[PDB]
Amino acid sequence: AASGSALIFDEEMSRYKLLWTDPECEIEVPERLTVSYEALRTHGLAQRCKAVPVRQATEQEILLAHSEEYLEAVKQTPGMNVEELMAFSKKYNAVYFHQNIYHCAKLAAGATLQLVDSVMKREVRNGMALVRPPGHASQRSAANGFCVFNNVAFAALYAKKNYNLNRILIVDWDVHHGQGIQYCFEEDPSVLYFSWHRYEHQSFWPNLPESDYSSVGKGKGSGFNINLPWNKVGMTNSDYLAAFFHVLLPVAYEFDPELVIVSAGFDSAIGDPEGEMCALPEIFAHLTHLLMPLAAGKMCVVLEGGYNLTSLGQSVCQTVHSLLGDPTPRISGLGTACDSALESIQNVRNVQSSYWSSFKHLAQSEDIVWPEPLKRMPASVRTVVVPPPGVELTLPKNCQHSDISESTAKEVQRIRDKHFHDLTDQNILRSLGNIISVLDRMMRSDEVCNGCVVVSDLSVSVQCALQHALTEPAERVLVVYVGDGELPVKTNDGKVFLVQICTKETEDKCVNRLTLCLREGESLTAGFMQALLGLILPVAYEFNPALVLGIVEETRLMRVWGHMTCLIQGLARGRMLTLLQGYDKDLLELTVSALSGASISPLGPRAPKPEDVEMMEKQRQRLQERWGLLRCTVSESW
Ligand SMILES: CC(O)(O)NCCCCNCCCN
Ligand SMILES: [K+]
Ligand SMILES: [K+]
Ligand SMILES: [Zn+2]
Secondary structure (H helix, E strand, O other), rough: OOOEEEEEHHHHHOOOOOOOOOOOOOOOOHHHHHHHHHHHHHHHHHHHHHHEOOOOOOHHHHHOOOHHHHHHHOOOOHHHHHHHHHHHHOOEEEOOOOHHHHHHHHHHHHHHHHHHHHHHHOOOOOEEEEOOOOOOOOOOOOOOOOEEEOOHHHHHHHOOOOOOOOOOEEEEEOOOOOHHHHHOOOOOOOOEEEEEEOOOOOOOOOOOHHOOOOOOOHHHHHEEEEEEOOOOOOOHHHHHHHHHHHHHHHHHHHOOOOEEEEOHHHEEEEEOOOOOOOOOOOHHEEEEEEHHHHHHHHHHEEOOOOOHHHHHHHHHHHHHHHHHOOOOOOOOOOOOOHHHHHHHHHHHHHHHHOOOOHHHHHHOOOOOOOOOOOOOOOOOOEEEEOOOOOOOOOOOOOOOOOOOOHHHHHHHHHHHHHHOOOOOOOOOOHHHHHHHHHHHHHHHOOOEEEEEEEEEOOHHHHHHHHHHHOOOOOOOEEEEEEEEOOOOOOOOOOOEOOOOEOOOOOOOOOOEEEEEEEOOOHHHHHHHHHHHHHHHHHHHHHHOOOOEEEEOOOOOOOOHHHHHHHOOOOHHHHHHEEEOOOOOHHHHHHHHHHHOOOOOOOOOOOOOOOOHHHHHHHHHHOOOHOOHHOOOOOOOOO
């Protein structure tokens, strides 16, 4: 029942800085916080968040992750002059100290714990902490890489201790490895750590052998540490999404965390002098959105690095936009990950295959400039619902019921007289008026985002929805069909891609459709999730539709439909129209809940049928030449 997003920030954390010459550290500046908060303010995002004050982490809280000797050493730095601060700093790798940095480090850590408490007490759904100094390179007894104390390691240890959590996912999308987090939880199966990072075969900072893909954790932590090293610079949106679809998300949804903490370094964005990657700030809107169906949306985003002030501001805004539920921007030009990334991805999937059900089939044979991001205003009415006539339902506050116009009514009659001569059922005709009215508000107004219409006649309804969308004009339409039979849907001209979930086995011929025949049984949920993350989402993202048309025929859906409806809203700026054939109160409630941006209830835990995995890998083989985002291995060369 939680709502809102926390934003935790205090300008005191900009009141320490580098006091001597050091080209290595001169990029970590106070303005990183100032620019990020002001960017949120400029775009109206800070004003929509719940401002939670910072506090100091206590001594006892710092000792959750750090040694008494290191804390006592850092505690003396407020009393040091500049000569003494420089000599203290030289004891460590890539870090400077300042009279006020100990104070600020305790605020950065306390801010993080405030964020954890706000989310874990259900006072907000999610939130972000904008802090300095960053934390993820901090070690038990050493400052490292601009980090004094390990803010995110605190947050996980604090959440285990005070909320008795058994499963916490940490996602570190900073462009540097967070070695301090890895070390902290190396033997701990209760904390799953994922990091991608510029590595370049160990020649990039921090130059550690243990930052490679072979470090899977130790002891009973084996399999709960996932390193994805980037061995070339210039990684793009496609490389980052390939990493999510084929490594992080399959593991995350199987792990089923009770809390997600993001080590959010935006030095992984285009323009950054440390990362030298090419991902656009818009990608962070999707990295955030793809994780929101985990842990019922309980996500704590904690600022780490990010050194190009421009992409820093833009990427922070894209993240908070998604935390607030604003429509995600369309990502164009996606395709195959590059060969270096595909090598990295296939190596981590292979070493992790001992530990995760999604990868188990692999174990045996049988001046930089870029365009400014567009505005992301939320829709006035997010979701319009059309239940059968005379069905009054209690709707969430951002949902509304359907009122057919005069122009719309004339359109239905023109359509009737041209394509459905022998049709007079005055409520089929009502549904067609409803479909056209909802689509018009979705496509020709920032007024409505998405919608759900309950229908009876599937063929007429589908044909009217699709044909009307194609002349809006919606350049491309993704159709997602749960049911058997043939739809009045042509996939011959490249403007429609059809995903069909059915029960009868079918040979696919064209590469503009994906047909998934999943065995009924206790394994159906895991197979569907496997298909959704590894097949459906890669193709949908590469296809980049302008509208998503969901269709469920009246003829096992309840557990996965909410996750699909949430994740598929990463496409088409969230513009999804769902046609439900027949009235099912629970399915309609679940659909409306997911469409409106409500928290998605967790899946919990049963590994997929090997016959389903074989079916899905045959689909990947059949489709990945056309849709390269499906690839999770390096291609065979002639
Ligand atoms: C938070 C973080 O992970 O981004 N810290 C990165 C520390 C970079 C160390 N500088 C290496 C030398 C480059 N000239
Ligand atoms: K990282
Ligand atoms: K671990
Ligand atoms: Zn970094």
